[PDB]
Design a protein around this ligand. Structure first.
Ligand SMILES: O=C(O)[C@@H](O)[C@H](O)[C@H](O)COP(=O)(O)O
Ligand SMILES: O=C(O)[C@@H](O)[C@H](O)[C@H](O)COP(=O)(O)O
Ligand SMILES: [Mn+2]
Ligand SMILES: [Mn+2]
Lengths: 189, 189
């Protein structure tokens, strides 16, 4: 009645976890996520680039168990908006998460169900505490891949739908060569 | 009713987490842990070196929340035995843990309550999955500090007493210039 311990190699330079399957998110997999839909359509038509890749080592859903995963968030913009992850709440309202930044320049946008927002800058060595109840999205604000490792409860689950429907209350853009976190004009509540 | 997200800087070269207090474990804090008690007494008398330091960022005990901590496990031997951490089970039988090796050369010794053992080699980039129910001890098998980051449930707790009383069923030693994991002669069960 004991699971076998194991070790796996993670390459901090590439984000690749040996033996884990690469899950790929292309821009075409993110319809309705970016503010500039015309820019989205244009970039999908012309290229449809990879926005991010995930390597996950996950256990069966069980209270007390832990998953981990790396993300390689590629550099880019859709109009003014930097490339980002889809973003989600956890399905369980009482499950936190820890991120460890490994490479590149980025940050995390978090929000509560009421839309109260928080931005946390991430550079290599930044550990981010994602408290229970906060939706979380990472953003690449640089010209190189933004790579991090996340450790999360095996029963936290995922709620992508809420973010797919309403988005985040803030967006992260480049204006006149500088990074700005500003009100999302599509956000209601 | 939402905790504030935060980011903290971890130096992967030193293990130091900015703003966290250094908890120091000297050899004198580890009476009855090493097989060669005469060597232990001698080294405590002569020097009483730091065996390891921990930097912890911990939340209040709450189901679903996560702690993280770095350890700097210094190089050394007590007789034939490499420097190691005290080792513990978690108080809760259904709480796993994830370790991320950052610097140096080491490994993890794990065991179940029945004494069934597992050794996992750790070099930078090795992520170790510590399943529920397994006691866990890290060992520095090299000449430089062995540094890692651990992420664990905020309600996992600690049972040091079981290990203090009975020890691990295996010990990690140097014999004729090579690292060996062998039966602990003090182990009973
Ligand atoms: O565990 C997490 O929350 C992360 O590993 C994310 O899943 C990952 O960064 C990809 O983002 P998303 O799940 O929002 O598509
Ligand atoms: O969370 C853990 O299990 C680790 O951070 C250890 O506590 C740390 O390495 C120090 O070892 P110990 O707690 O066995 O003294
Ligand atoms: Mn998550
Ligand atoms: Mn532990």
């Amino acid at each position: 009645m004991y699971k076998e311990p194991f070790g796996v190699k993670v390459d901090f330079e590439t984000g690749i976890i040996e033996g884990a399957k690469k899950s790929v998110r292309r821009l075409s997999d993110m319809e309705g996520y970016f503010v500039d839909e015309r820019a989205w359509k244009e970039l999908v038509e012309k290229e449809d680039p990879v926005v991010y890749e995930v390597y996950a080592v996950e256990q069966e859903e069980k209270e007390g168990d832990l998953n981990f995963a790396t993300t390689v968030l590629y550099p880019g913009k859709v109009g003014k908006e930097f490339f980002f992850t889809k973003g989600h709440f956890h399905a369980k309202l009482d499950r936190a998460e820890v991120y460890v930044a490994l490479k590149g320049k980025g940050g995390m946008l978090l929000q509560t169900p009421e839309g109260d927002a928080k931005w946390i800058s991430m550079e290599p060595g930044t550990v981010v505490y994602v408290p229970a109840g906060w939706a979380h999205r990472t953003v690449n604000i640089g010209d190189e891949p933004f790579i991090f490792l996340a450790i999360y409860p095996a029963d936290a689950g995922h709620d992508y739908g809420t973010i797919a429907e309403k988005g985040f209350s803030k967006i992260v853009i480049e204006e006149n060569g500088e990074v700005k976190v500003v009100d999302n004009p599509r956000w209601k509540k």
